[PDB]
Write a protein that binds this ligand. Structure first.
Ligand code: DMA
Ligand code: DMA
Ligand code: DMA
Ligand code: DMA
Ligand SMILES: [Cl-]
Ligand SMILES: [Cl-]
Ligand SMILES: [Mg+2]
Ligand SMILES: [Mg+2]
Ligand SMILES: [Mg+2]
Ligand SMILES: [Mg+2]
Ligand SMILES: [Mg+2]
Ligand SMILES: [Mg+2]
Lengths: 283, 283
């Protein structure tokens, strides 16, 4: 039972969905299909957890959540574009995502490539759109810089590349964690740091804490994902294989605890971040 | 005979090549192949004309050319990433570019997808890298915003999408120009506007002139490209087909003239921009 988190997710998804709407109107008829493809790729069925994170970090520091609209859109658009390319035939070659045809299936491969390309750019536009933030010049430099680092070849793209190059190879835990830290950790950290920055009230100490929280939940998610695949398996390169199931479950709990410890400096305004940490390993 | 332009191209290419070197060192062994793929994609044999444009616009306004290093890198990296995805099997399915194997041929498709993805991000990092510019907060907001608009779905990516969706269709001149304006015009304009902005001395009037120049040379290039394909054809949807060869050649001259007219407000510091305009339609 996680009532307030369900309500927080709902408000988070509504706010970022309405914010994004303004981004996806093609400027002309010739551009309509590309914009439709991008829209399709964002209507992917996700829970907008990265926007959730942006908004929650903003409010933890005292900002109005809408101050983080630019951040929330930007991280969701980065996340969207990553999934579209990830599904491509040359990559994971998936026909479905969350029950629906993937973008290259609903459209075609060439459209899907570009839709992903278009979405990465729009993510940066969104971050700087004055309708989406009121942030000050240097804060927004911090934010833009951050997003590019987190999404690029030393971040999420790097993580995808590590994934490809790990096909075959026998990974240990340190290598598995390195790969996850890049593939999904980076953008999760960016989510919380961008949200915090967006409040205008962010101090060095507070960002450190939030980065610690974010690193912890990013790993907890991947550990629990593996645990759930195993448990669903005994229903009808992974953490359980490396550690054994029992030990994997404890690891996930220790990470949830490290995440909650990181949030000790904050007041009740940080409760959604705390409830998410709990949910990730409870789910 | 275009002696000073040859020397300008040479200095332009050396400066941006040295500037980019600092970007392409992988932070770890696991990331080496991705960074190698990106490097490969930038060592594509091009003349760095977009960097040329950035540096020339900067110097036309009185800046030291290195002030535009961030701009020059960013537009070349955007240009690089566009070619890698453009060559992909789902897109143009080219095995060679300028005589060399394309990135998906030297590496594989999945690597090439990501290399293009990584390069788009690095382009934004480069633009904000303090080693590459000294520009002030609001100027650099103008620049970042500009690059995202020019490269994204209302710009170059849009142009690629128009290209795909024009397969088949019978284009008139107005539609052909609309497609070119997006596919290559946008990023050319961005090149000159980013360079100008990078000087710190850019005024509204001067940017207008440079945008006019850039729009004109962007079209002149595409018209002359078509003319050269025809002339090489009688050696051993296009402008010549739409207009006839004779008329296409005149059109290219009228565009060169519109470009040079746009530069009337500037002194001798704008000569490289003038010599490029001449070269494009003389070549
Ligand atoms: C800790 C965290 C961000 C988990 C996100 O899971 P996901 O990537 O499947 O999220 P979404 O449902 O937003 O796609
Ligand atoms: C950054 C990114 C796209 C991660 C998805 O990785 P994956 O292919 O292992 O996960 P999924 O099951 O979502 O395809
Ligand atoms: C007017 C202009 C920018 C022409 C560029 O030609 P190109 O795209 O082939 O340039 P490069 O040789 O730099 O790839
Ligand atoms: C933005 C971009 C990649 C343009 C290249 O278009 P093209 O495929 O018509 O030209 P090329 O002959 O270089 O592939
Ligand atoms: Cl639309
Ligand atoms: Cl390297
Ligand atoms: Mg994958
Ligand atoms: Mg996948
Ligand atoms: Mg897993
Ligand atoms: Mg093409
Ligand atoms: Mg091509
Ligand atoms: Mg042509």
């Amino acid at each position: 039972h996680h009532h307030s988190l369900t309500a927080y997710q709902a408000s988070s998804q509504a706010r970022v969905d309405a914010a994004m709407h303004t981004l996806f109107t093609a400027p002309s008829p010739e551009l309509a299909r590309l914009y439709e493809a991008m829209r399709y790729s964002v209507m992917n069925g996700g829970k907008r957890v990265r926007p959730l994170l942006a908004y929650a970090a903003c409010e933890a520091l005292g900002g109005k959540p809408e101050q983080a609209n630019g951040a929330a859109c930007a991280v969701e658009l980065i996340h969207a574009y990553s999934l579209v390319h990830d599904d491509l035939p040359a990559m994971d070659d998936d026909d479905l995502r969350r029950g629906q045809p993937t973008t290259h299936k609903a459209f075609d491969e060439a459209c899907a490539i570009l839709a992903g390309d278009g979405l990465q750019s729009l993510a940066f536009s969104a971050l700087l759109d004055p309708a989406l933030s009121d942030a000050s010049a240097e804060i927004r430099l911090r934010m833009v810089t951050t997003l590019a680092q987190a999404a690029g070849p030393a971040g999420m793209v790097g993580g995808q590349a590590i994934d490809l190059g790990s096909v075959g190879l026998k990974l240990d835990q340190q290598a598995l964690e390195y790969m996850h830290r890049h593939k999904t950790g980076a953008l999760i950290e960016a989510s919380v740091i961008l949200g915090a920055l967006a409040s205008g009230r962010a101090e060095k100490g507070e960002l450190k804490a939030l980065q610690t929280y974010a690193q912890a939940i990013g790993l907890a998610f991947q550990v629990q994902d593996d645990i759930l695949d195993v448990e669903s398996d005994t229903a009808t390169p992974t953490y359980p294989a490396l550690l054994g199931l029992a030990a994997a479950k404890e690891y996930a709990l220790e990470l949830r605890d490290q995440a909650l410890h990181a949030l000790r400096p904050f007041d009740a305004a940080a409760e959604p971040l705390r409830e998410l940490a709990r949910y990730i390993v409870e789910r």
